[PDB]
Amino acid sequence: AMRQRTIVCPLIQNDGCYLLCKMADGQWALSGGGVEPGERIEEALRREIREELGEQLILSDITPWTFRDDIRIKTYGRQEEIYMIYLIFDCVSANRDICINDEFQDYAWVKPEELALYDLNVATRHTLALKGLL
Amino acid sequence: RQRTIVCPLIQNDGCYLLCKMADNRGVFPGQWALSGGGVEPGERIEEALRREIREELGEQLILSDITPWTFRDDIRIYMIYLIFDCVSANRDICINDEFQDYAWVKPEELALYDLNVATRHTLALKGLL
């Protein structure tokens, strides 16, 4: 009866720079969220983007890239293991118009050569390294 | 409503494994496909993949590498397909319920087989057709 979820995450690129979001108190990460009952995976992705990054952002292309699993121990206040499947999509944005919500404290469009300067969380480092960007 | 399916694109020494579905009858031939298995609650996706392979292709098949490739979705129930690139150390196959025959196929001959829709889309995306 372990908690298990499928998570959709977009790696958003514009004019060669990648979007990173700073989690509210707090590391830098890709955005993303869970797929809810009755939703298709891309529907969940677009919903998460609207919610977290706003309605001004315009995506030109969304393409499934790769997936992996992860196990995390979350502390709500009790501790529980959560098994996740990460579905990572390559996204190209037509613009850079971002409007953040309370899940994020800040955001940045970062050139690949500067990604390593950021205090990224573990999952984000893994994803970027697999893409050959880090 | 929700199902996660794991599928291996298995290759050995330049050839890819295709399996002929037992699913279908009369004059309508069973189509050729990649193996596909469900993931039980609490089961890791790679463990589910290895279980599917053991169940439908036999325990004798040794995998030298299993690497996530890509995913997509489909409907039949809403499915999420998780497709892995795999390399087998050998070509020993022993089939059971899902399949009635198998073949190791050169990439240039894959298109000659009557591939099911999902398999066709997957091989096309891989650049093999």
UniProtKB/Swiss-Prot annotation, chain B:
Specify the domain of life of the species encoding this protein.
Bacteria
Reaction(s) catalysed by this chain, per the record, are:
a ribonucleoside 5'-triphosphate + H2O = a ribonucleoside 5'-phosphate + diphosphate + H(+); a 2'-deoxyribonucleoside 5'-triphosphate + H2O = a 2'-deoxyribonucleoside 5'-phosphate + diphosphate + H(+); dUTP + H2O = dUMP + diphosphate + H(+); dTTP + H2O = dTMP + diphosphate + H(+)
Keyword list (alphabetical) reads: Hydrolase, Magnesium
The reply to whether Glycosyltransferase figures as a keyword in the UniProt entry is no
User: Which cofactors go with this protein?
Assistant: Mg(2+)
User: A single Gene Ontology molecular function, please?
Assistant: dUTP diphosphatase activity
| Keyword Magnesium attached | yes
Query: A single Pfam family, by name?
Result: NUDIX
Q: EC?
A: 3.6.1.9, 3.6.1.12, 3.6.1.-, 3.6.1.23
**Which residue range or ranges hold the Nudix hydrolase domain?**
1-129
Q: Under the cellular component aspect of Gene Ontology, which terms does the record hold?
A: cytoplasm
Motif Nudix box positions after renumbering to this chain: 37-58
Spell out the InterPro entries in the cross-references: Nucleoside_triphosphatase_NudI, Nudix_hydrolase, NUDIX_hydrolase-like_dom_sf, NUDIX_hydrolase_CS, NUDIX_hydrolase_dom
Gene3D superfamilies noted in UniProt: Nucleoside Triphosphate Pyrophosphohydrolase (3.90.79.10)
Assembly notes = Monomer.
Matches recorded under HAMAP family: Nudix_NudI (MF_01846)
Q: What does this protein do?
A: Catalyzes the hydrolysis of nucleoside triphosphates, with a preference for pyrimidine deoxynucleoside triphosphates (dUTP, dTTP and dCTP).
Similarity remark: Belongs to the Nudix hydrolase family. NudI subfamily.
Q: What is the designated name of this protein?
A: Nucleoside triphosphatase NudI
